[PDB]
């Protein structure tokens, strides 16, 4: 039986932006979690609803792998019941999450001396995101009274802002790569169990 492709998730060359996060469904495979047990001691591993030591004897219908790049001090927001601009207008996790979250610093890969302007987040949004909702949309945000008619200016703002990663920043403003494994369980043949 095929193995679960956990290597192609953590070891990919490019990660997405947080406002346009990536998703990968994993099904019909044997899940060897030793990959997570052998992780180097600079990763950040947490689990919710299930003990890490007992992933090798549970069965799930689906596993979701969500990957993105955030700032150093915003990894605290990738958790159930959190508030802030990343948790509100970029990426939201339910209250009863039931899954694991892994994060690691990627300064050697995503920083540039001239500044990396390819990583962006959403700064202006009128209301919070529902859990696992993605908002890829570039429309002028009116913070004023008169309509904007799709033109920048006073009270008319481009919604997205840029990280601009540089090697000389403090560790809390350095890039971090984040993977979220969501364990799904419904009334189904339970494809992803794995010895």
């Amino acid at each position, epitope marked *: 039986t095929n193995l679960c492709p956990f290597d192609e998730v953590f070891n990919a060359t490019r990660f997405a932006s947080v406002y346009a996060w990536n998703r990968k469904r994993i099904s019909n495979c044997v899940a060897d979690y030793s990959v997570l047990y052998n992780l180097a001691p600079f990763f950040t591993f947490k689990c919710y609803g299930v003990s890490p030591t007992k992933l090798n004897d549970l069965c799930f219908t689906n596993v979701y792998a969500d990957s993105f790049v955030i700032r150093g001090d915003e990894v605290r927001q990738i958790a159930p019941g959190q508030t802030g*601009n990343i948790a509100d207008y970029n990426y939201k996790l339910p209250d009863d999450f039931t899954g694991c979250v892994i994060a690691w610093n990627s300064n050697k890969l995503d920083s540039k001396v001239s500044g990396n302007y390819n990583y962006l987040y959403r700064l202006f949004r*009128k209301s919070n995101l529902k859990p696992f909702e993605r908002d890829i949309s570039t429309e002028i945000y009116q913070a*004023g*009274n008169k309509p904007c008619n799709g033109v920048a200016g006073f009270n008319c703002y481009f919604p997205l802002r840029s990280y601009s990663f540089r090697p000389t*920043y403090g560790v*809390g403003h350095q890039p971090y790569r984040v993977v979220v494994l969501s364990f799904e369980l419904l009334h189904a043949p339970a494809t992803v169990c794995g010895p």
Partner: antibody
Amino acid sequence: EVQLVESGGGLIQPGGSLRLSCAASGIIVSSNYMTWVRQAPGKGLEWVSVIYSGGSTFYADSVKGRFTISRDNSKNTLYLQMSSLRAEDTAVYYCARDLGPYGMDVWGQGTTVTVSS
Amino acid sequence: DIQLTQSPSFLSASVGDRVTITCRASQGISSDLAWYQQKPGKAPNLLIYAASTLQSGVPSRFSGSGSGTEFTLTISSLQPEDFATYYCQQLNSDLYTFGQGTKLEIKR
């Protein structure tokens, strides 16, 4: 033509309650970051609390539990409810429109609050 | 949790000079930092944002530059309406931090 008027400050005793109200014109308060900043007499600016456009609220460590920022869309007004007052809350108070990484561009004019018996 | 410190506190100048004010950060906060002006009695006014960009309606005398932990504001020519108190302000996720301020005044 873009303006932030304030009202609601005065004398109060150490332990009472008082609600400051900030009026807005040309700015929808439910679609901006709105901030309360106080300046004590001759000491300098200090952040109090912020309410996000989606409704999240954050407070300084000095006013946790004691203060509550709120927003009224129907009248387009910002509010700060103050309770368990101490003598260190005597200051001028400002409501500001914050743009994040573009600073605070629109300020109110100032409300004076004195907390003494 | 960032603490910002402004180096001059009561620095004076004369009409026609230049002047330089500095803000240190204690951890390293990228390049997001704003500079405000306040005349006595009135509300503060915005001058610079993102540490180098100029605000609409502001003259071109005011310049700013810096990064990481060191930022600098500079006035190239004192003019009889430029004597006020200036602050540096910061950001980053549920804390807003100001500096003590830097009074500027006539020299005699």
